[PDB]
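Why run this: before we spend reagent on co-expression, it is cheaper to look at a predicted model of the complex and decide which construct boundaries make sense. The entries below are exactly what would go into the expression plan.
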Amino acid sequence: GMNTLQISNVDDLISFYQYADDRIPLISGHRGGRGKGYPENSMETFENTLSYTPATFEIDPRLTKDSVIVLFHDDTLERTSNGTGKVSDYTWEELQNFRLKDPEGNITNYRIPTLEEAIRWARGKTILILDKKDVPMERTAQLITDMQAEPYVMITVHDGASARFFYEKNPNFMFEAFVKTKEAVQDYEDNGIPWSHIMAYVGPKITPEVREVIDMLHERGVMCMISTAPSDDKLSTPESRAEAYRMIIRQGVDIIESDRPIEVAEAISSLIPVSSSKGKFFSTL
Amino acid sequence: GMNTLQISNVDDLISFYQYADDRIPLISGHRGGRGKGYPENSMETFENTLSYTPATFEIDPRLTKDSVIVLFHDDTLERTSNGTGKVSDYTWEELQNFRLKDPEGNITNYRIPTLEEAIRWARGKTILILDKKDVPMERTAQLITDMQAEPYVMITVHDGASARFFYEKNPNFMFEAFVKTKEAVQDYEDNGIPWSHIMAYVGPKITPEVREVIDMLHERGVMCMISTAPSDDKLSTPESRAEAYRMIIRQGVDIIESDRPIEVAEAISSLIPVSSSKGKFFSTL
Ligand code: NA
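The model came back. Tokens follow.
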């Protein structure tokens, strides 16, 4: 039994991400989310997270020796698998011999997944958000376009010029855009990226400056995301982490990206409104 | 002793990189160059390389836990050191306890260097070229500027927008710019970046399209570099590699960036002009 998002096409995706004052706080699993028995960038972890909360998943596509795109964050295999060396030293088939490790170092029986497997699974359940490692931008553009996956596979962009590369190739793409400053807001505008095609990553922490950016972005219809992965996820107790996740929502932030999405869900459950224009986008499978 | 480049100020650096038909073919050590007993991104490898050839060094700055800039390519420690985990997990004091591995996996008694130490050492000897890992652009701009290191520390930029960010901060910066297509040529012009401040990285291989871009760039006074690191450096024998390096220069390329810069030097020494407008920039220490 899983929580799902109900986004049938690009118009639904744009709507989902149009800021509204009655919006539902959103959760995104950093590198898929992780936990005891649940490695980063694993199909199993995505599925586990949806059993507790609706979420999107930010993932790490990178290349094997035979140019297969797999999900795996690091430049070396040791932290989140029982392998050694670079992902790009091994074919996909060879990579299947390794097993993923959870954050405690326990070796699971889960394998490195392909991006294709994740995309096929995500359709009708969630939205994936692609970070950039070593897959060429043109390849990423073509894979999403060829697969008609625009309604459920978003692209992370660090500035307006990268956004424009993608947007000019396919104007139905949706972006997670880095927007940490007033100058960043101007950058996207100068590059002609529609705000309707933007959800904004505003950084790892809230400051008065970042609050001003969030107000600017809300005026433009843009939802804003804090990533707690480097910051509040690292607090020593679940109780301190829970307080921190609630404080982020109380400050007006729309989306929390976290390595601990289930904890985020439990902490903010009491903040989820009963009535919302966004209620229609949520269901269960 | 050592081969040195004799560059006294930013005007000398600009003139060094002004394309001329009688140029001296140049060599750049990718990730600093490497070899048996000589790890990537190591002071010792830079010094060894200069004993055999003049060269520049392309290096990988990244952040420690306490925001010190060190040189280390991978996001995790296992391939080129005896460390485990991420460079950013450790403070500089902790990282100094680890030791570097050469490409065959042999542990040396060499440490992960700071960018500062490298900059200190490079002054009067060579030019360092900074790749982009996780040091933000603002921080890179500051450190070069604060150190008055513009004549000997270049910044790699992937497009005109990145170049513009830097150039607006300090119009004395010199760039290694990615310029792989006619569209990329136009990008730098549209962003107002003077060609006098650009050396061009044109990719890992020569094709007719790339030869056309090299022609265009030569017309604009821009010297062009091929990286052999993913390509010709991987050929199986030193003889095949040497033929490959000569062919690159025969095809009109100005600069070879390589993991094997001493081999490049030995291969192309027979192609170095005996009289050149660029002779003045080379000396010995
Ligand atoms: Na320091």
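Residues 238-250 of chain A form the longest helix (13 residues). The interface with chain B takes residues 74-76, 78-79, 84-86, 159-161, 187 of chain A (CB under 8 Å). Bring this page to Monday's planning discussion.
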